[model samples]
Target: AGQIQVLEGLEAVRKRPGMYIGSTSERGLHHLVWEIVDNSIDEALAGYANQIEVVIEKDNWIKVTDNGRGIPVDIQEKMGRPAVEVILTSSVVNALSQDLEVYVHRNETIYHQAYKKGVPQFDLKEVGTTDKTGTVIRFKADGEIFTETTVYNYETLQQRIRELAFLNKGIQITLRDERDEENVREDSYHYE
Candidate 1:
């Protein structure tokens, strides 16, 4: 018998990653990027990290490496599962809508199998991790996103995210799009 220290109150959340994560489209897959970025924010808040680097590889794998405290891999006596699994297994249906001011809400679960989420299923783990420092989260995009040569606008996103970094004032966030061979543009402005 195994004791599962899980999100006891969120059984259904696992059944519906879409209802909470918006949609299971490539956009949803990209949400993982945002999620990791937020994790960096938490580290910055704690003053353990000062730089975060994000790289979008050509084959559709996202490398979210941060110079911050790593995710607590330490086993929680109360929760038998690894903390990483615990979070990845989590699904909150909280509908953060402008019409309502709610601190919480409910939804279904779409992550237990995790592989069944949609076109962009993925798993999480620490990479190049060590007792020395930092957290790295890497996940791949389901084949669905490569319909064409999909490229992330690093500078555009960097400009926006850079503002966020600037607002934080003490941390730096670098975004990179690495591909085997593809058209590249950088340090350019959008004219429209």
Candidate 2:
């Protein structure tokens, strides 16, 4: 009660993922991956991690690893749970952040009601401490989310990941689709 608020059970999350993420379809499902990727990018910004490896395994399982701090295992006083759990759970602040993510939260409320809604934004909590530094976030998307989940458009996701890698400068971010053995593809792209 001092600073931690405990959240039990994962049932709510599974009941209807759409309410938290916006949709149970591909967009929301894909958002889970992107949320993790975004946290990885934040690590890149911290300069603790440079290379982030993203893998899409067979049957649509995904795994993302980084040379940055991993998910924080520390307990959160606000949630009465580990910081990782706090990071994963949805809340009013998160909801606001998600809705006004593109806007400024520094005294500016996009909805004008001082209220906004968003899902859990951070997929990874802590990567490495002061010694071993790097992060990895891996999760499998819901198959039912999309009918064309098997077909990934490299032109889109790759282009974006590469751009982030370059934007950080000197850091290398790799995006790979290893779902198929015969159709393995890799691209080293950079942008300012």
Cα lDDT of model 1 by residue, 65-174, tens digit: 66665455445575565554444444231111101110100011111212222211333323232344565555554333323333454654667666667677767677
lDDT of 2 by residue, 12-115 (tens): 44455566668755456456556767777787788766677767667655666776655554556665555544554443223312221211111111101111
Off by over 4 Å in 2: 1-28, 90-131, 144-151, 190-192
State every prediction's TM-score relative to the real structure: 0.60, 0.60
RMSD of each: 10.6, 11.1
Model 1 clashes, total count: 11
Looking at model 2, residue 121 earns an lDDT score of 41
The per-residue C-alpha lDDT of model 2 at residue 178 equals 80
Q: Per-prediction count of colliding residue pairs?
A: 11, 22
Given candidate 2, what's the lDDT at residue 111? 9
Give RMSD (Å) of candidate 1 vs. truth.
Answer: 10.6
